Amino acid sequence: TQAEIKLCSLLLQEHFGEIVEKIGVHLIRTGSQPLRVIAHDTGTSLDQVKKALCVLVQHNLVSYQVHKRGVVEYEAQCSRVLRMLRYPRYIYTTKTLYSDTGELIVEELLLNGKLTMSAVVKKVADRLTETMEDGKTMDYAEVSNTFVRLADTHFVQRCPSVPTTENSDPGPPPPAPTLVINEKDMYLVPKLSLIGKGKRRRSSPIPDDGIYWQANLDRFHQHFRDQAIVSAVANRMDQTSSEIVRTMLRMSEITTSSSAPFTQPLSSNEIFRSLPVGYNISKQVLDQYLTLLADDPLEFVGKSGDSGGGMYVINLHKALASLATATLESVVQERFGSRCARIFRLVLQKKHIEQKQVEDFAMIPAKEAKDMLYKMLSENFMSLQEIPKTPDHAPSRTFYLYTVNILSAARMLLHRCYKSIANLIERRQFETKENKRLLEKSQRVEAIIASMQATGAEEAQLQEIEEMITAPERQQLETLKRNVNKLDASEIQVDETIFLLESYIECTMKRQ
Amino acid sequence: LPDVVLKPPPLFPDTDYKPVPLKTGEGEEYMLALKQELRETMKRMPYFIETPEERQDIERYSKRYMKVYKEEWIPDWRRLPREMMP
Amino acid sequence: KEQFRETDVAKKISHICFGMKSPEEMRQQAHIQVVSKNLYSQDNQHAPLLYGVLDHRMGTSEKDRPCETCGKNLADCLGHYGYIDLELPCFHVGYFRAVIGILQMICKTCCHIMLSQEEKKQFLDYLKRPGLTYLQKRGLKKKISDKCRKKNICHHCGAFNGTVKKCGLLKIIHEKYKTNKKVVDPIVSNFLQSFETAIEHNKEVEPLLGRAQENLNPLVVLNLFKRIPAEDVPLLLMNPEAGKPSDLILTRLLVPPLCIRPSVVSDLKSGTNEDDLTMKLTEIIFLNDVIKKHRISGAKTQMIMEDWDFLQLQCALYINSELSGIPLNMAPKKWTRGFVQRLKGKQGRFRGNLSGKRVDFSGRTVISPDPNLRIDEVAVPVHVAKILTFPEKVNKANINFLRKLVQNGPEVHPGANFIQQRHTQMKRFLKYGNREKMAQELKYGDIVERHLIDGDVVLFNRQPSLHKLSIMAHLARVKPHRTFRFNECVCTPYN
Amino acid sequence: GVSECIIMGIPMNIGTGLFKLLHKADRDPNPPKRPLIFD
Amino acid sequence: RSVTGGAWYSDQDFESEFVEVLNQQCFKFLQSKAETARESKQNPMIQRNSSFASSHEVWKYICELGISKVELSMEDIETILNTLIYDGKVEMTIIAAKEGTVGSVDGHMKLYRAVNPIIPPTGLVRAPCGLCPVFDDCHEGGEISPSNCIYMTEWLEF
Amino acid sequence: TEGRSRDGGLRLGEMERDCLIGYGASMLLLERLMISSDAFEVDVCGQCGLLGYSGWCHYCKSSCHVSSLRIPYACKLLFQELQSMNIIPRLKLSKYN
DNA sequence: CTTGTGGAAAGGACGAAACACCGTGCTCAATTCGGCAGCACATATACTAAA
DNA sequence: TTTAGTATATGTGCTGCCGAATTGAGCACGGTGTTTCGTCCTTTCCACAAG
RNA sequence: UGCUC
C-alpha cells in the first residue's frame, strides 16, 4: 500500500501541516503503537507528538485503545484518510439533496470533525448572516430543523459517547475513558430551547455538552452507490426504469444495512403507491417494467418471491460487479483502443479461451490480436491458467488459456488511481512552488489595493498597479490558474472511479 | 532476427490515445471551487499546526507589533486520554 | 570571499546496512542505458559501441582507453554501473525462496498478512523489544510463517487461500481451486463451469480440467507486492528502510562497471577474451530484443512464454550459474562463472581475495643450515636484500646514514633504490642522475627506500602452518650466499 | 568482529587494538576564558 | 471454408475494411431501429420487441444494401453481430420460437438490439497518469517525475 | 600475480592470518593485508551510503556528504559485485573519535 | 609460340540462428550429513446416533 | 438424555530427494581460445577460338 | 597434468 501511504502523506501535508503528517504516516506504516515509542521513532519533541495525535483524533482519523498494563495504543485509519478526499463530493451531494443550510452544516462537521449541535448551528448562522443582507438575521429554529432532518436521514451521526464515570467503576480514573458507541441515541438530537441571531462579523452552561456529531460517510457512500446504479439503469433502458429503481432504493435504504447480498424484497403495490404522482403510470405498466427488468441479463433486480402480487428484490452486489466491469472495459478501451476492448470483453464473457478462438470470435487478423493480448498481460489485466499435461510444466506441452480476474484487476486499477491522484497532487504542488515568487508578487500588488480600500482611498493608486512588470506575467498567472483548476478537476473526477472500485472490493469480501 | 538499436528508447514514448476530456457542468465547477475554498480555509484553521519557528535573531520593540496572534481550540480532555495534556 | 569546506575527515565505517534497491533507485544509480547487444563496432578499430555493452562510460578495462564518465585512467577509475530494462519481469533466484515465503505469508486477494488483530499486536510487541538479533528475527519469521500457514481463510476480505508451492523451475503454483472431497464450495464449482467455451472449442480442456490451479507469474506477483500495506511489511521481518516487497521481483538489471568485467585484447587473432558476465548480459539483451520482436509481430502465447522462461533462466544463471532444477533441453552447454561462483569457492573473493591475499615486498627461497647465527637471527642473501626495500623517514637522527646510503646507490648493497620527496610525491630513481646532489638535498620528512640491512625485523614463515610458531619475526643479517639460513634449534617450530 | 575488521581493512579489536593510547603533552585542560565585557 | 476461402478472406488477405463497414452498417441499422422503437412509445414490451432485430432480418437488410459482391450467409451476419456484442454496443437475447421466417435454430431465435453503454468514460482515463505507458517507472525523484512530465504538460497546455 | 614466471608475490593464506590473529599483532596484519597488498582510497556518500567517484555522488547528485575512506580493493570489488546482485551494502560512516 | 573476352570456380566476408548431421539419451552416482517436505497415518477429541 | 461409534484434525513422527562441504601453498609447461553452416560477393585463373 | 615440501 505504498501508493496509499503516499496519498495519505500528501493529503495530510496539504490539509494539516508537516509535524502532524509525519506522525500520521508513521501510524499508517507501523500501525498501533504507544505514544512514547512513536515519539522516539519520529524524532521530534513530545509536545508536538501530543498535538499531532490530538488534532488527528479530533477528525476521527486515529483511534486509541487500551491493552495490558493499562497502556494506550494509537492506530490510524488509512480508509478515513482516503475518504477525506471525498469532502467536495459530500458537500455537493448534501447541497443538491438539501438547502445551503445543510451544506454549511456538513462543511463545518467535516472541517472540525467533532462538534456539538449548538456550536455547529451557531457557526452555520454566523456564516449565513454574511450571505444575506438588509439587516435580516438568521435564527436557530430553521438551522436545528435542517440538522434534525439530516439526522433522521442518517447523514449525520453522534460520535461515541464516553460512559458515565460515576456509574461505571467509580474510583481511580483509567488512562483512557474507553469511549463506547450506542445505537439507541445514535441519531437522537438533544432538545435545545435556546435560540439566537448570528453576528455579521462586526468585531466590535452548554446544554448539549459532551454530545458530539460527525458526518456519516457510510450514508454518503450508500447514496453515491444508489445514484450510480440509477444512472446506469437510466443509460441502459430508460429514465422510467431509473425512477422506479430510485424509488425502490429509497424504500430499501431504511429497512437495510450498508452491506448485504440482497435487500428486503418489495411488492408491486407498495412501489406503485410510493412512486411520485408526477408520472402517469398504471399498475400494469409497473408490472411490465419490473418483469422486463427481472429478465435483464445484467441482473439488476430479481423476483425472489411471488406473494403479494409482484414481489421483487434488488441485487446490489451484482450491480456493483456490473459497474466494476463497465469501468474496467471503459479504461481498457480508452487505453488500448476499441479493438483491445473487444478482445477484453470476448475473453471476459468466455471464461477461458485461447488465441485461435479469440481470433475466430473477434475477426481480428493475426499479428495484432496476440499483440494486444500480450500488452494486457504485461499490465496485469488478465492471468493465464496454464493447464499442464505433465507436472513438469514445460511450455511446449501445455495449453495456455486467457482469463480475466475481476478482483485482482479491480485492485490493480484502484492502486493505479491512487498513484495517479498522488502524481497529480505532486504536480500541483510543484507548479505552486516553482511559481511562488510570482504568486507573492501578485498577492502584494493586489493587497496594495486591498489595503486602505475605503479609509483614505485615493484614486491615484489605481493606475499604478498594472504599471509594474506584473502585466506580462499575468499570462503566466492565468496559465498556472487554469492548470491548477484542471488538475483539481481531474483529481475530483478520478475520485468517482476510486469510490466505485473501493465499493466493489469491499462488497466482495466476507471479513470472516 | 531482431535489429540492433543504437540509441535507447525515448524517456517518454508517444501514444496515439489521449486522455478523455473532463466532464463539464455546474456541478464539477462548483466542486472545484469548493475544494479550492477548503484548501484556502483549512490552512488558517487552528487544526493546521505549523512548524514552530525557532532561533530568533534578537528581541525588538516591534515584536509586540509583529507578534502572530491566533485563537487556539481547546481539546476535550474528557474523551482524550491524560497523556496528551500539556 | 572564500567558503569554509573541510578537506578530509578521518571517517571510520561504523556498520554495513544491507538492503535492496527498487527499479527507480536502479535507474537513479545508473548513468547510461545499455540497449545494444553487440560489443564492438564494424570498423577495423573495433571500438566499443555507444549505449551498448563494454561502453567506456561505465568505467574502463584498458590501460590506453580512459573512462568517459570521469577523466581518469584505469588505476584511478572506480567504475560506474548501468541499468538494463527488461520487457517482462523475472523472479530473482536469490530472493525466490523469500518470494515464496512472502506469498505464503500474505493473502493472494487483498495482499494482507494472514494474522488476526491479536496476533498482529502480539508480534508487534515482541518485535519492538530492543536488541533484536538475527537468530531471533529468523525464529520470529519461522513462527509467523507457521501460524500463517495454519490458517486457510482470510479475516480481512474472506477470500480462500490454499497452499502455495514451487512447481518446475522459477514457477509458483497457488492451489486456490483445490479438490474438496466433502461438499464443494460455490467458488470452485463456478471456476470449473467457467470453462464451457474452452471445452466447446477444445475438448482436451475437459479431461485436463483438474489440477488447474493459479499460476503466479512474475507480473501477478509484482502487482500483488506493489499493493501490500506498509503496516504489514514489518510483520514480514523485512526492514522497511532496507527495501520493499516489490523489490524482490526484478525488472531492471544492474550491469557492473568494466573493472569487474576485464577484457583482454588479443591482437594475435581476430578476437578478444571476455568474462562470462558480459556474454550473459549480451544474451539477456538479445532475449529482450527477441521478446519485443515477437510481441510486435504477434507470436503465439506458447513461444512467448517459452522465451519468458528462457529469459528467467538466463537471468538466474547470470546471478547463480549453478542450479539443480534446470531442464535437460534448457541445460547450458558449457560452464559459466556467475556471481555466486565468483563469491563462493576456494578461489572466491572471501577466501581468495579477502581472508588470504597476495602481498608484495616478500620472497620465497630454499633454506640451509647455519649454526653460527643466533636463534633470533636469520640470514638473507644480498640478491634478495637489494630487491626488498624498506621506507625510512629522514629524521634528525639517521640523516647521515641515509645520505651515505643514497651516495652508495642501488648497485652497492648498503643503499637505497628510490627517494620520495616530502613536498611532492614524485619518486626519484637513484640509478639515474647525480646521487650526490640528491644526498645533499635530503630534507627532513622524506622517504628513502633503503635496502634490507642488518638489524631489520623480518618475518620468516613456512607455508604449511599448523600453529602460530610456524611464523616468527627474526633479525635479518645479509650474507653473500643465495639461501635463507637460520639457527637449526628453530627447526622444530617450523618443522 | 575480527573477520569483518580484516575485510574492511581496519585494526581488529582483539590484540593490541583493544585499548587506546593517549599523548602526555604539556597542556592545561579547561584553559582560562577571556571575559566578555559587553555581556 | 475453414482451410481456404471464406467471405472475409480475399486472396489470402483479411479484409479489415470490409468487416469494419459491415459493423458500422449493422450498428447504424440497429441504432435506427432502437430510435424508432423509443419514439413509438406505444408500450414498454412492444418497444423492446420492436427494438429487437432478428439475425435473418439484418441479414436480408445487408443483402439489400449490397456493399460487397461476395454472398454473405446468415451465420456470417451472426458472427458480425457477435463481434459487435463483444464491442459493448449491442445486446442479444435468445427467445423461444418454434418456426417462422428464420427457421435457423430449433425452437430458438436470436434477437439483437442496440443498447447504450453502462456508464460514461471513467475518471481515471481523463488523467494522463491512467493512460501512461511508462506508468510503472514513475517516481518522485528521477528522470521520470510528475514535476517534469511531458504528458501532463501537453495535457494542461491543450 | 601468482607465479614467479609472472613476477608474482607470496600469499598470506588463511593459516597465516590465523597465526597473526593468535599473536595479536593487529597493526602488522593490517599493514600486510590492507596497506601493502590492495590499499585504495574510495569516496563514500554519507547520505545514501553508496560509493562515489572524484568526490561526487551520482545517486544524490550532491558532493557535500561525500568523504574519502581507506579500503582494500578486494572489499570494494565485493561491494560492487553485491550491488550488481541487488544486495546493496549501505555504509554509514562516522568520525574515528 | 603469345593473346583475349567471357565463364566457372574458389575463397572470404556475412547474417539467420543457436553451437549435436537426426532431434536422444547415456552413466555414475565420489562420501557424508544436516536441513527439508511428503505422506501417512494415528490417535484422540468431538459430535451425531441408538437405546 | 447419555454412552458408543464415526470422522476429522492436526501433530507428530518416520523417510527420501536436496544442497553443501572435502589442507596450505610454490613451481614448471601444452592447449586453446566461439563458430560455423550455408549464401553471396569478388577476384582470379584457365576450356577454347584467335594472332 | 606433472611436480616440490
Ligand SMILES: Nc1nc2c(ncn2[C@@H]2O[C@H](COP(=O)(O)OP(=O)(O)OP(=O)(O)O)[C@@H](O)[C@H]2O)c(=O)[nH]1
Ligand atoms: N598443463 C596444465 N593442465 C591443467 C592445468 N589446470 C588444469 N589442467 C588439466 O585439466 C584438468 C582439470 O581442469 P581444471 O583445472 O578444472 O580447469 P579450470 O581451472 O576449470 O580452467 P580455468 O578455469 O580456465 O583455469 C586436469 O585433469 C588437469 O590435467 C594447468 O594449469 N596446466
Ligand SMILES: Nc1ncnc2c1ncn2[C@@H]1O[C@H](COP(=O)(O)OP(=O)(O)OP(=O)(O)O)C[C@H]1O
Ligand atoms: N600435502 C602436504 N601438506 C602439508 N605439508 C606437507 C605436504 N607434503 C609435504 N609437506 C611437508 O613435508 C613434511 C613431510 O615430511 P615427513 O612426512 O615428516 O617425512 P617423510 O616424507 O615421511 O620422510 P621419510 O619418508 O620419513 O624419510 C612436513 C610438511 O611440512
Ligand code: SF4
Ligand atoms: S510521466 Fe507524468 S503524466 Fe506520465 S505517468 Fe508519470 S507522472 Fe503521470
Ligand SMILES: [Zn+2]
Ligand atoms: Zn569511471
Ligand SMILES: [Zn+2]
Ligand atoms: Zn485476503
Ligand SMILES: [Zn+2]
Ligand atoms: Zn548519496
